[PDB]
Write a protein that binds this DNA or RNA. Structure first.
Ligand SMILES: [Mg+2]
Ligand code: NA
Length: 350
DNA sequence: AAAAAC
DNA sequence: AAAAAC
DNA sequence: TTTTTGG
């Protein structure tokens, strides 16, 4: 029997139903842009269960017993089996509101609100936006346009590994005992990604040392002419669990990666890097949260509430019946507390 | 406000 | 048919 | 959009 929760499935990078999940991913993106939460969530769950399957869907009998697939999803599956394409998703791909949303949000610093504001102002290309004498861009959007070609072209495992070394070298200069862990998609065994995420924690660090680290590291890169963009968000952490973002201290950077650190034109590459500074006692929760994937986390939180009367987030796990916070030194302990079998990072690609 | 994250 | 999906 | 409706 296949579970409706991504956290009770193994989802590797081997997808047998990519023609189906591409269509569902487009329809989900279309409902996410039109804000429609309900439909959007059902398509992501459908697309997610299909990625977990150890076989391709060739007939409608192949959908029997698979959760998450209702009358609409089955109609899209039946459409792809017949013509080999989705008329529903092809419609969305030719739709100007989607093309424009996909294009505008692809800029670093432009989200759903700016993309819609621009689409309603009659804009359809990034060229017309930059040429427009009236528009005023945020320091973030100015960075996003200035390094667009570098950011829109995915980062790879040699580059991510070159960034990891660079991050580690900067951190251990200020905190020798610091543990730096590459999270996100790369930790899930991905070959490519848009950014490289990191989790920094230090057992021997003082409270002042934890707060001043991201400033010490970013100014160090600024002095070396490597910092292209920087935004440090201060910690709001305590801790009341609620039914988003993390309260950990973090920063969103664009780093200059010299080609000589990887194995040309510029001699460097603009790379989007996220650094998350977390207290040592909360490290497993932060590592479980920043590893992802989005759907895996959503289902970990969903399973915890609905099947266990527990509240999980990036900071802690709370048992609602025992009225106590559950302590964990590893991701394996969080899974244990939840009553789940451990899922390896490269099996969380839901 | 809006954006940045899995 | 109506509602909640954390 | 899917699921649940006294499961
Ligand atoms: Mg990432
Ligand atoms: Na964006």
């Amino acid at each position: 029997k296949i579970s409706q929760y991504a956290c009770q499935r193994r989802t590797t990078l081997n997808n047998y139903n990519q023609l189906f999940t591409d269509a569902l991913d487009i329809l989900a993106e279309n409902d996410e842009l039109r804000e429609n939460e309900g439909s959007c969530l059902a398509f992501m769950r459908a697309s997610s269960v299909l990625k977990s399957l150890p076989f391709p869907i060739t007939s409608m009998k192949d959908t029997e017993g698979i959760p998450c697939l209702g009358d609409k999803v089955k109609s899209i599956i039946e459409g792809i089996i017949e013509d080999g394409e989705s008329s529903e998703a092809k419609a969305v791909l030719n739709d100007e509101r989607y093309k424009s949303f996909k294009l505008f949000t692809s800029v670093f610093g432009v989200g759903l609100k700016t993309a819609e504001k621009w689409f309603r102002m009659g804009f359809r290309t990034l060229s017309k936006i930059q040429s427009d004498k009236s528009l005023r861009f945020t320091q973030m959007q100015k960075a996003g346009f200035l390094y667009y070609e570098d950011l829109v072209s995915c980062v790879n495992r040699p580059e991510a590994e070159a960034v990891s070394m660079l991050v580690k070298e900067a951190v251990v200069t200020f905190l020798p005992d610091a543990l730096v862990t590459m999270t996100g998609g790369f930790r899930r065994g991905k070959m490519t990604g848009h950014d490289v995420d990191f989790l920094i924690t230090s057992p021997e660090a003082t409270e002042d040392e934890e707060q001043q680290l991201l400033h010490k590291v970013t100014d160090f890169w600024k002095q070396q002419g490597l910092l292209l963009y920087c935004d440090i968000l201060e910690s709001t952490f305590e801790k009341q669990p609620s039914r988003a973002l993390d309260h950990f201290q973090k920063c969103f950077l664009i780093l200059k990666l010299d080609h000589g650190r990887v194995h040309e034109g510029k001699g460097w590459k603009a790379i989007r890097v996220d650094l998350v500074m977390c207290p040592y006692d909360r490290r497993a929760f932060a590592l479980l949260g920043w590893t992802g994937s989005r759907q895996f986390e959503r289902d970990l939180r969903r399973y915890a509430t609905h099947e266990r009367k527990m509240m999980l987030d990036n900071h802690a796990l709370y048992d609602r019946t025992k009225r106590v916070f559950l302590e964990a030194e590893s991701e394996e302990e969080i899974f244990a507390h939840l009553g789940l079998d451990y899922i390896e990072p490269w099996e969380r690609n839901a």
